[PDB]
Structure formats: structure tokens, C-alpha cells
Amino acid sequence: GALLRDLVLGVLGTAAFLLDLGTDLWAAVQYALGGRYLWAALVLALLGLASVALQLFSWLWLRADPAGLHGSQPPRRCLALLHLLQLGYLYRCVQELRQGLLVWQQEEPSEFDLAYADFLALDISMLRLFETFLETAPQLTLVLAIMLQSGRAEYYQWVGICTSFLGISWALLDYHRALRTCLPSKPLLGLGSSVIYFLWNLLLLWPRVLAVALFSALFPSYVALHFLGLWLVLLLWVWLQGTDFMPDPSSEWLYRVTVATILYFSWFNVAEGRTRGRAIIHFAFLLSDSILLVATWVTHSSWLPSGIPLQLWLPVGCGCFFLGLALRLVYYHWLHPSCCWLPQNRRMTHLAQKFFPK
Amino acid sequence: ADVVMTQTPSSVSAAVGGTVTINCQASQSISAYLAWYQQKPGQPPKLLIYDASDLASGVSSRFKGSGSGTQFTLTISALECADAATYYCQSYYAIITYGAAFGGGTEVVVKRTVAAPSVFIFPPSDEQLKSGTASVVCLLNNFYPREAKVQWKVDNALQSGNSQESVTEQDSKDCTYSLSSTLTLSKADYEKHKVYACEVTHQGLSSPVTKSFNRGE
Amino acid sequence: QSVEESGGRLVTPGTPLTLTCTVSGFSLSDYAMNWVRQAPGKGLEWIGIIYASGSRYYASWAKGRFTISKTSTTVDLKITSPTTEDTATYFCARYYAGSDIWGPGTLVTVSSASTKGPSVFPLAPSSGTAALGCLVKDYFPEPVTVSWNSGALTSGVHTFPAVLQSSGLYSLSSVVTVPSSSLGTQTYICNVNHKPSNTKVDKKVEPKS
Amino acid sequence: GPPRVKAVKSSEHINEGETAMLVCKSESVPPVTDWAWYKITDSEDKALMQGSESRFFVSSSQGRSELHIENLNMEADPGQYRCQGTSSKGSDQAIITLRVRSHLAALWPFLGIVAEVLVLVTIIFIYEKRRK
Ligand SMILES: CCCCC/C=C\C/C=C/CCCCCCCC(=O)OC[C@H](COP(=O)([O-])OCC[N+](C)(C)C)OC(=O)CCCCCCC/C=C/C/C=C/CCCCC
């Protein structure tokens, strides 16, 4: 039943990704055909940048990959162009889907083939996490800012925010699933731990997105400077920190950039094993920035059209923040197993080991 | 720098008895110094609301202005057919420094029930031929919605580029439209062909209506 | 309390032009006056304002291109160098709170073409309600007024807005629907008036045998 | 009877460099023919003459008067203004309070942001470079 579960979950995940991309393109087309071209240009640029980063990540991973992945129907030469054409992610998805389908169809495939399928699933999970924090979060913030600024919310925008929510949920659940699966003996009920992890992560992530959206709608010309400054500071922090995630040392600039970007929205373990120090510092920084943005919105209150109910969304945001903090404390202090320390996915092992210090 | 007014949406529709809203966004703080105007086609505009909320003299209570700062909104209720017109906002906050720029305009279209168009055709008069030009007129009368397609067929041939359409605004009494299509041809071509038809397609027509005539007959 | 503009006409690009707005029922020393223009089928552009004390303020885009002045009873708006982009209807408006009292407006056309009288042709009634009308074709510049039976027939009168033609002259038709039994007994005459060419034409529209 | 005048906005909050427009209105009959604006000061009220410091403007019509103050200053402009209308049957007054917001409060999310960035960089740079 494990093979069936893995294949169905992978199909659901790829379907969700496809849906997110489709709704994003639909919203861009709607904006372009209905009016202002700046919104369409912004979403197109954001999507392109996220896609370029993902393609570079996948290409670098395949290049660094040692002897393996021999079931590559497209020639290595063709593979590079395929990834270059923003088709590397889709290639990984279809590769995992085909591998899982073949494994399931076979009466009992060899453990080597099973391990290969697991390797593909772990790699796609990592890419899903990077893709969600690099595209869904910025897209969600942009959509919310556009809605709060224009004042006219549409069905396509509502569908886009709901799809973004579903994508973030699946991405976080799958990432925690992989992290807990890379640890030996699986002694705890991983489904519950993954559910609570995703719950607190999304509960504290949403308020940050809402705050950034409010700031963007109140001062669209300062978002660039604000994001660049915070992103540069986070990048410098990562530079001061240790990073040995992928074999290529020079190519790690992409990893540090992605880590800084994901840190700009939530918490993502970087390295070492000392916790409660950097997590607390990060939480204080995030809280201060969110409070500052909220204060700016309050100061320039009468500056947006009467669209989405803010006197109703804000209390929900504060409640979600409190609930997320409580659940995060519960999951970290008590419900957090560590367990200490054939192709084996060393990237996932690296992350899991740096995620479970004890 | 002159204050620029951003009036949205460009068009807005509602059924008889409904309610519409229009938003005007000022480039800077204008406090409560925004006036609303209603301009009907041809006639001069008419002041509806001043100081962003005070109703003008002799104006029905259906019009209600709200807002302040940089965001204002006009709302109409129990929409009658006599409300079909273009509405404009205008800032007058310290005109000596920011001017009094007007809004882009908001065409308010009432949505009545569907009405089939009465089709009539008019051949060119002998005097116009004496002059040396022939104009055939196809008149679509008292219909709704506004979208309708008129097609000119001369000896079963589909014409294009030698005709001109004109559409009137919504009637104040029954919210209906009227449209004229004026096919223009020289004397020679007019005498060349024989049968002239006007294929009219509209939502209120379950089948394309074709009014036609024969030259001479 | 009312106002009435005058001075609209056709002029060649560059020739100056002065429009006059005559108030009635109030003094110009106790109220300000605005000048607002509107291009054909466009929105309203605010041109300028003259206060009661005499201070004059002009819109940013119109600085220098216009000049406002006033006497004890009329307000004058002079255009120093009209361009093709200066053809529009001009309204004068009393400024109290916004602009309450407005004028009928005068049309100013700036083009190189010359004036041309209108040609009127009858749209004979077809053969329980018949339609018939008058085709006002090949005239310039705007506007032309059409009335039925000296203004005694208004119900069912549809005057279509004019449209630019290939030749560059305007054309429009004025149609009207009437009871079919009245075609034999009631005389329908259309009265077209084109002030820019001083052309008055009363054309009867008789039915066809 | 006696006239009754009231302000359109009893309290306003503008910023320096711009131009405030205070306006009083009245609907009594006979209408208010003449209007006069005074600025309240300690123990005395000073008349506001048109053309003063090339920045004041008064535009008065029957029953309505606008006071335009150009180039809002942080020292002399804020305060209380009194509009007084004198119809043939008497006179009335209204009080409007004007505050001038400065660039200190206007550029609040710029200084705030750069301060937070500075604090963050110092915190991490001592927490890692030397403390860690
Ligand atoms: C090589 C360098 C790479 C890294 C940097 C590159 C990109 C990252 C940053 C992107 C942000 C772009 C900001 C664009 C600024 C210019 C906007 C503009 O000129 O106009 C914006 C438009 C204005 O509208 P208006 O005139 O009506 O405003 C009237 C306002 N008032 C009423 C107050 C008068 O308003 C709007 O568009 C409102 C909506 C704005 C939405 C902003 C979303 C920001 C999202 C950030 C997440 C980014 C992640 C990047 C990750 C990269 C990983 C590699």
C-alpha cells in the first residue's frame, strides 16, 4: 500500500502545482486584457524569476549527481535545453510519476528501483518547498496587495489565493514528511506531527504575508527598497553562517539566496545544532517588521478603497498569529523527536541531520 | 502639481430598481471637497452633490455621496431609466494651487428586459440619385441589449467598408436603443446591382431578420 | 440665474479666437466663473477660473495657451494659437460649491477645411406604424438641428448623432415613427438648420405611391 | 433673523508645504453679505488680509467663504481660526482648528525601517562574529 499512497500523493501534489501555475497565468491574462499592464508585468516577472531559480537548482543538482539516474530518456545534451526552457521541474515531476507507476505496476520491483523512486520523491519534495516559498508566497502577497489597493476583488483572484493556500499546505506537509522519513525507525505517528507542523507554520506565515501586502498597498514604491534591504541582511547572515548543502561550493550562492528569501517569510533551519537562539532572534525580527508594517497601515488608514473587510481580517490575523505561536511551542518543546544521527539522497540526509540535532 | 482624479469603474450596469456605486480616488488629500456631476448626451452637466456629501438643490435622495480624504464614492438606488448618463467627479481643494481636474467619467447603463428590434429599410431618394450618390438606410428600432450586428448584402454579396453605423443613447422612457446603418454607393454601382438587403442579428431575434428591397420595384 | 456662451465657429490653426459668456440674473463681482471644455465624445477638461476679485488661475496643461478676462457683465476666453487638438464644446459655469449653473456651451472647430452646406434627402415611408425621415448628408462643420413640423412633432423622433465620413464631411439622419393611417392625412416636413453656413431648409417627406 | 454660520470641517489636519482650504458656510435669509477671517492668538485676534505674505487668499460669496493658506508653516499657521459673517440682521462666528503635520511624522516608515535594519545587522554581527 505504500507504493499506491506515494503515487497518489505525488499525483495530487503535481496537480496542485499545475493548478497554481494555471490560476496565476489566468490572473495575469485577466489583468492584461482588462486594464493596467503593470500588474501583469509584475506577476510575469515574479513567475519568471522563480522558474529560473528552480531550473538552475534542478540543473545544478543533476550535474553534481554522481553515477546514477540512468533512466534518462532525453539525452544529456537535450536535458540542458529542456531545463533551460522551464521544463526541468515538469521533467522531474513526470519522471517521479512514471517511476512510481512502473514500480506499482510491477509485481515486486528490486529494492534498487524502490530506492530510486524514493530518491526522486525526496528531490521533488525539496524542489516543491523551494518553489512554494519562491513563487506562492510572493504571488500571494502581490495578489493580496492588488486586491486591497484596487478595492475590486474578483473570482479569479479568490481562486488564486485559495490555490496558493492549498499549495503552501501541501508543500509544508510533504517537506515535513520527507524530513521525518529520512530519520530511522519512525517511532512517532508522523502524520500527526506533520499536520501540526504545517498548521503552526501556515498560521504564523499568513500574518506576515498580510502585513507585507498591506505595506505594498500603502507604499508600492518602497516595497523594493524594504525587501532588498531585509534580503541583503539575511543573505549576509547566511554568509556568516555555515552552508554545505550541495557539492558545488561556487554554485552555493543560489542556495544562500533561496535561504535568505525563505527566511524573509518564515523560519528555515540553516546549519549547526544550536536552537532557540537563532529561532528566537528571527522571531523577534519578524515580529518587529510585521508590527512596523501594521503601524504604517494604521497611520495611513484612510488611504485604501473599502474592499476586503480589514476590521475583520486583522482580528483573524492576530488570532492566527497567537494560535501559530502556541502550536509552534507545543510542537518544538514537546512533540519534537530527534533520534540523533543503493543510492541514498545525501541532500535530504544533510537537511534532516541539521534539523534533528539531538 | 495639479491634482489628478482617478474615477473607476469606466462602465457600470444595474437593473431597474438596483443600486450602483462609483469610486473616485484623488492624487492627494482633498478633504471633503469633491463634487459629482451628471451629464446626459448633448445637454450640459448638472451638479448632483457638493462637499462630497451635501445634496444639490432639487435633487432626488437616490444619490448619496460618501467618503473623505482621497477616497470618495457615489451611490444611486432605485435606478430609473432617466439615470442613464455619464457621471464625473471633480476636486476643488485649493484650486489656486492644485486646479480642479475632472474625472474620467462613468457611463451608467440600465439593464432592462430583452426587446426585439423593429427593422425598416429605406431606399435612396430620387433627389439623392439626381445628385449622384445612393444611400440605403437600415433602421433598428427600440431594442435591447446594445450589442447587435448589422450586415449589408447587395446581390447576395457581403459588403464591408462602404457603410456607416450610428447608435443613439438609451431612451429615457423605456431604456431602449436605436441604430441606423447607412450603406453608401456611387450612382454607377447602385445601378449595377439590383437587390439590397439588411441582415440584422440580435439577441432578441431567434432567427436573423432580413429586410430587403428591389431597385425600381 | 443663467449664462449663455457665444462665439463658437470654424477657424484655421493659429488664428486667435475669443469666446464670450454672458451671465444673467447675478453680478460677476459676487461669484467666480469657470471655463471648461469637452472634446467630441470625451470627458470634461477644466480650463480655468476667474474669481470675483479678478484673480485668474489656469490649469497646468493650459498655461499660456488661453487667456481669461472679464467685464462687468461678460467673461471672455481668448485662444492665442488654436491647434487641431483644440476642437471642443466650451461651457462657462458659476463657481459657488463646484459648478452649479452651467451654460449651453459653444462649439469651437479648428481645421483646414472650409464650410459646406447640408444636403437633405427624404427617406420615404415604407409600405401598424410606418417610419420616415430626412437624411442630412455632406455638411460641415457641426452642428445641425432637425425639428419636425416646426417642433410640433416630438414623440417618436430619433435624431442620430453625426459621424465622420471618408470625404471628411459630417452626415446624419433624423427618423420618426407615426401611425400608418396618418400618412394619407398628415403632412410631415423636416426643418434642418445649419448655422455655420446660415442654411435653413424645410424639406417635406411625401409618401411614395 | 440672526445668521447661523457653520464650518464644513470643524477640524483639519494638513502638512507643511501644501495649502489648507478652510471653508465656512451659512444658509440664513437674508444671506451673509460680508465675511471676515481672524486668527486666534493669546489675548487678541488678528485679521487675515488678502494677499498677506503673498500666501493667504480669501474667496467670499453670498453665504460661503474659503480661506486658502499656501505653504503651511509649522510655527505661525497651526492654531484656531474664526470665521465671522455679518448679514443685515446681525453676525455669527465659527471656529476651525488647523494642525500642520511635518516630515518627521511623514517619513516614519523610512527611519523606522533603516533603524530596524541597523539593529538587526548589529545583533547578528555580534551574535556570530564574536559571541559564536
Ligand atoms: C536582481 C534583483 C533580484 C531581487 C529583487 C527583485 C525583485 C523582488 C522585488 C519585487 C517587488 C517589486 C516592487 C515594484 C515597485 C514599483 C511599483 C510601481 O511602480 O507601481 C506599483 C503599483 C502602483 O499602483 P498605483 O499607482 O495605483 O499606486 C498608488 C499608490 N498611492 C495610493 C499610495 C499613491 O502598485 C502595485 O503594483 C501594487 C502591488 C505591488 C506588489 C508587490 C509585491 C512584492 C513581493 C515581494 C516578494 C519578492 C520575492 C523575490 C524572490 C526572489 C528570489 C530569487
Residue numbers in the entry:
A (entry chain X): 7 to 347, 368 to 384
B (entry chain L): 1 to 217
C (entry chain H): 1 to 127, 133 to 214
D (entry chain B): 103 to 234
Mind quoting what the paper says about this structure?
XK-related 8 (XKR8), in complex with the transmembrane glycoprotein basigin, functions as a phospholipid scramblase activated by the caspase-mediated cleavage or phosphorylation of its C-terminal tail. XKR8 forms a heterodimer with basigin (BSG) or neuroplastin and requires either for its localization to the plasma membrane. XKR8 is activated during apoptosis when it is cleaved by caspase at the conserved recognition site in its C-terminal cytoplasmic tail. The structure of hXKR8 and its mutational analysis revealed a hydrophobic cleft on the lipid-exposed surface of the molecule to recruit phospholipids, an intramolecular phospholipid path of several hydrophilic residues, and a crucial tryptophan (Trp45) at the extracellular end of the track that regulates its scrambling activity.
To visualize the structures of XKR8 in a lipid environment, we herein performed a cryo-EM single-particle analysis of the hXKR8–BSG complex embedded in lipid nanodiscs. The single-particle analysis generated a map of the complex at an overall resolution of 3.66 Å. The complex contained hXKR8, hBSGΔ-FLAG, Fab, and a belt-like structure surrounding the lipid membrane, which appeared to represent MSP1E3D1. Local resolution estimated with the Phenix program showed that resolution around the cytoplasmic region of hXKR8 was significantly higher in lipid nanodiscs than in LMNG micelles (EMD-30636), which may have been due to the stabilization of this region by phospholipids in the nanodiscs. In the current model, the C-terminal tail after α10 initially extends in the cytoplasmic direction, is disordered, and then turns along the groove toward the direction of α10. According to the revised model, a disordered loop region following the last transmembrane helix (α10) connected to the C-terminal amphipathic helix (α11), corresponding to amino acids 372 to 382. The revised model indicated that the caspase-3 cleavage site (amino acid position 355) was located in the disordered loop, which was consistent with all identified caspase cleavage sites mapping to disordered loops. The C-terminal tail region (amino acid residues from 368 to 384) including α11 of hXKR8 bound to the groove with van der Waals and polar interactions. The three hydrophobic residues (L377, F381, and F382) on α11 fit into the groove comprising residues in widely different parts of the molecule (L185, L189 [α5], F251 [L7/8], Y261 [α8], F274 [L8/9], Y337, Y338 [α10], and P343 [L10/11]), whereas the two polar residues, N371 and R373, were located closely to the charged residues of D71 and D129, likely forming a tight hydrogen bonding network. In addition, the side chain of W67 appeared to make a van der Waals interaction with the guanidino group of R373. These results suggest that the resting conformation of hXKR8 was tightly maintained by the intense interactions between the C-terminal tail of hXKR8 and the cytoplasmic surface of the transmembrane region.
